[PDB]
Amino acid sequence: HMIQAYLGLGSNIGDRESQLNDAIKILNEYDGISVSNISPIYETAPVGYTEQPNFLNLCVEIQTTLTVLQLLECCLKTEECLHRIRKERWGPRTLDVDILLYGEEMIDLPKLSVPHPRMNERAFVLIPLNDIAANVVEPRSKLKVKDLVFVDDSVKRY
């Protein structure tokens, strides 16, 4: 049985587009993950610590037989494959793979929260997410993505 999940990908170091492309390929090659939809890529001003490089961000849909914890392990392993050495959450990274949605399920473990608890105020997530998942309901707000998305001029088509 397959679970439909959504991942948020980001990169702000080096050849960002190549790193995101390779990440998608790696994710698709794991047993138990198939990438089923890919959003457009956006160039986005860094949010939070603003004095670091501009990001590329996108979202992907996957179909998965993995548990949410196994999925998290795969996401983290993919960052390691793309040589993410920096671990400062506020700082730059070659690759970030975030679990945005895991079916309509919700979990808030000390170190795994899904739906991603910050997604609803991030245009660098909601814009590419709305591109592929406009009618998907975000379980915490009980709103469809298209009803959460908002205009943000710092998010540009790449």
Ligand X SMILES: Nc1nc2[nH]c(SCC(=O)c3ccc(Br)cc3)nc2c(=O)[nH]1
Ligand Y SMILES: Nc1ncnc2c1ncn2[C@@H]1O[C@H](COP(=O)(O)CP(=O)(O)OP(=O)(O)O)[C@@H](O)[C@H]1O
Whether 99 and 108 have beta carbons less than 8 Å apart is answered as: no
Instruction: Find the shortest distance in angstroms from Cβ 20 to ligand X.
Output: 11
Check residue 138 for interaction with ligand X (CB under 6 A): no
Q: Pick from 19, 39, 44, 78: which binds ligand X (CB under 6 A)?
A: 44
97 contacts 26 by C-beta, under 8 angstroms: no
Q: Kindly tell me which of 31 and 110 has the beta carbon lying closer to ligand Y.
A: 110
Shortest distance, position 38 Cβ to ligand Y, whole Å: 18
Separation of alpha carbons 43 and 156, rounded Å: 5
Residue 55 sits in the site that holds ligand X (CB under 6 A): yes
- With contacts defined by CB under 6 A, how many residues of the chain interact with ligand X? 12
78 scored as a contact of ligand X (CB under 6 A): no
Per annotation, catalytic residue among 86, 98, 122, 131: 98
114 binds ligand Y (CB under 6 A): yes
Task: Give the phi and the psi of residue 120 in degrees, each rounded to 5.
Answer: -70, -10
Clarify whether 84 is annotated catalytic: yes
Active site residue 122: no
Phi, psi of 96 (to 5 degrees): -130, 130
Distance CA 77, CA 133 (A): 25
∠ Cα 103 22 90 (to 5°): 70
Cβ–Cβ < 8 Å for 115, 98: no
Q: How far is the CB of 96 from Mg ion (least distance, A)?
A: 4
Residues that bind ligand Y (CB under 6 A): 75-76, 89, 96, 98-99, 111-114, 116, 118
| Residues identified as active-site | 84, 93, 96, 98
